């Protein structure tokens, strides 16, 4: 692909394939030319080395990339390792409908509630708001709804307050040591930029309010909402799965 300014970025597989093709063509040319056997043997050894470096690089001499010293990245290096497909993309995807911010105290909340800023809620729930706006007749076409949301009119806030009503969200802290690092709450729209976390769940989360951050996800499908409300809800997880002792002790 091209980059801004006419510079190109490419993958090492192109270099490895080009080397293999060049050596193969030269071997064909030599064979068609009846060269002395020593040259032919040298060419055959070179082609062996090129193909072996293409398949799994680093088992003989680790051919290094041109205009650089780093060894090239072969086919087998993409599958394996902590940065391969299996562990980097096939088990650890990134997802849509999510954000993060800093967490605050909010001691007035109930055990099943969390404070969610208006801006984050609007950005996370846009499509639901478009649907509601079109359904109610306020916006004739989806482009009209998009413009209305961008302009931030009062009806937009009313529709958001209506669509955020009984829709739970998931909150997650960075090191997820056990299953209580994910729980579902019912958002309460607030003004500001930091999330509000009930004091009683801090022990389970292992959270302190000196700079910690949290992530928020939105369950889309209807079965996902039912699972969030009936399995992960914050008022369902009171006992430790490791031992039956409570985990909502006042700290």
């Amino acid at each position: 692909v091209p980059l801004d300014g006419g510079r190109f970025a490419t993958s090492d597989l192109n270099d490895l394939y080009r080397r293999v093709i060049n050596r193969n063509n030269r071997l064909k040319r030599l064979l068609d030319l009846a060269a002395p056997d020593i040259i032919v043997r040298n060419e055959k050894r070179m082609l062996q080395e090129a193909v072996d470096a293409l398949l799994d690089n680093g088992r003989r001499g680790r051919a290094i990339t041109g205009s650089n010293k780093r060894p090239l990245k072969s086919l087998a290096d993409m599958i394996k390792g902590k940065q391969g497909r299996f562990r980097q993309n096939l088990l650890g995807k990134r997802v849509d409908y999510s954000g993060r911010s800093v967490i605050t105290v909010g001691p007035y909340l109930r055990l099943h509630q969390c404070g969610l800023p208006k801006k984050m809620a609007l950005e996370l729930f846009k499509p639901f708001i478009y649907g509601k706006l079109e359904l109610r007749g306020l916006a004739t076409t989806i482009k009209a709804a998009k413009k209305m949301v961008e302009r931030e009119e009062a009806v937009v806030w009313d529709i958001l307050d209506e669509v955020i009503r009984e829709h739970p969200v998931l909150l997650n802290r960075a090191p997820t040591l056990h299953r209580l690092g994910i729980q579902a709450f019912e958002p309460v729209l607030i003004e500001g930029k930091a999330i509000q976390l009930h004091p009683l769940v801090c022990a389970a989360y292992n959270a302190d309010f000196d700079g910690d951050q949290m992530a928020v996800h939105v369950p889309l499908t209807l079965e996902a909402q039912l699972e969030a409300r009936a399995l992960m809800m914050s008022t369902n997880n009171i006992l430790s799965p490791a031992n039956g002792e409570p985990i909502i002790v006042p700290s």
Binding site: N42, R45, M46, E49, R60, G61
Partner: peptide, 13 residues
């Protein structure tokens, strides 16, 4: 011989 792996040394030999 020392069982070298470098094709350059072999060709030189």
């Amino acid at each position: 011989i020392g069982r070298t792996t470098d094709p350059v040394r072999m060709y030189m030999r």
